[PDB]
């Protein structure tokens, strides 16, 4: 059985391709709107802040660079990080991840369903959210765990704070 390769645009007609695109776009819009109110569906208990606690991060999109002047006359340069779609995907317990701190998995910008693998699509189907591009793991303490499927916003960081930025640098090749 020498089966050939098949993509989603091969066996569709000129009339059904826009229908499929719309049927995916509206489902993604509805799924993103469903999670827009996480605190009223079934929030996990919120624990009080402890001095030895750690917090979850985000996955943003680097827009560009801008100047920014300070009240003392100095000029700094800021980089623009846009939080498009951050959702908690899965939660790994402390003893099953590291034994010291739990892990929360965070997804990034939305991508298309037609170019992801079967297992990834099954995971996002069970989760109820459209697939994400970059999926990362954040090491958090046991008192800062959040239910998976919770959205995160750029106001998670407040004006005046120090953050750490991880990314793949510009690859200059060999």
């Amino acid at each position: 059985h020498g089966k050939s390769v098949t993509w989603w645009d091969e066996h569709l007609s000129e009339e059904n391709v826009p229908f499929v695109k719309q049927l995916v776009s509206d489902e993604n819009k509805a799924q993103l709107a469903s999670k827009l109110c996480p605190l009223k569906d079934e929030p996990w208990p919120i624990h009080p802040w402890e001095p030895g606690s750690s917090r979850v991060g985000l996955i943003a999109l680097k827009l560009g660079m801008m100047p920014l002047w300070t009240k003392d006359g100095q000029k700094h340069v800021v980089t623009l990080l846009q939080v498009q779609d951050c959702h908690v995907l899965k939660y790994t317990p402390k003893e099953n991840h590291n034994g010291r701190m739990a892990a929360l998995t965070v997804g990034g910008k939305t991508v298309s369903h037609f170019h992801k693998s079967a297992s990834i699509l099954e995971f996002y189907q069970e989760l109820g959210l459209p697939p994400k591009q970059k999926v990362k793991i954040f090491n958090v303490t046991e008192n800062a765990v959040i239910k998976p499927g919770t959205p995160l916003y750029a106001a998670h960081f407040r004006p005046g704070q120090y953050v750490d930025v991880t990314a793949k640098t510009i690859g200059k090749g060999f």
């Binding site: 059985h1 089966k3 098949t6 989603w8 066996h11 049927l23 995916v24 037609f114 699509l121 189907q125």
Partner: peptide, 13 residues
């Protein structure tokens, strides 16, 4: 069939 297999999301729909 084998010739007309669809994508995962299309099959779920």
């Amino acid at each position: 069939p084998v010739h007309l297999r669809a994508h995962f999301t299309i099959w779920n729909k």
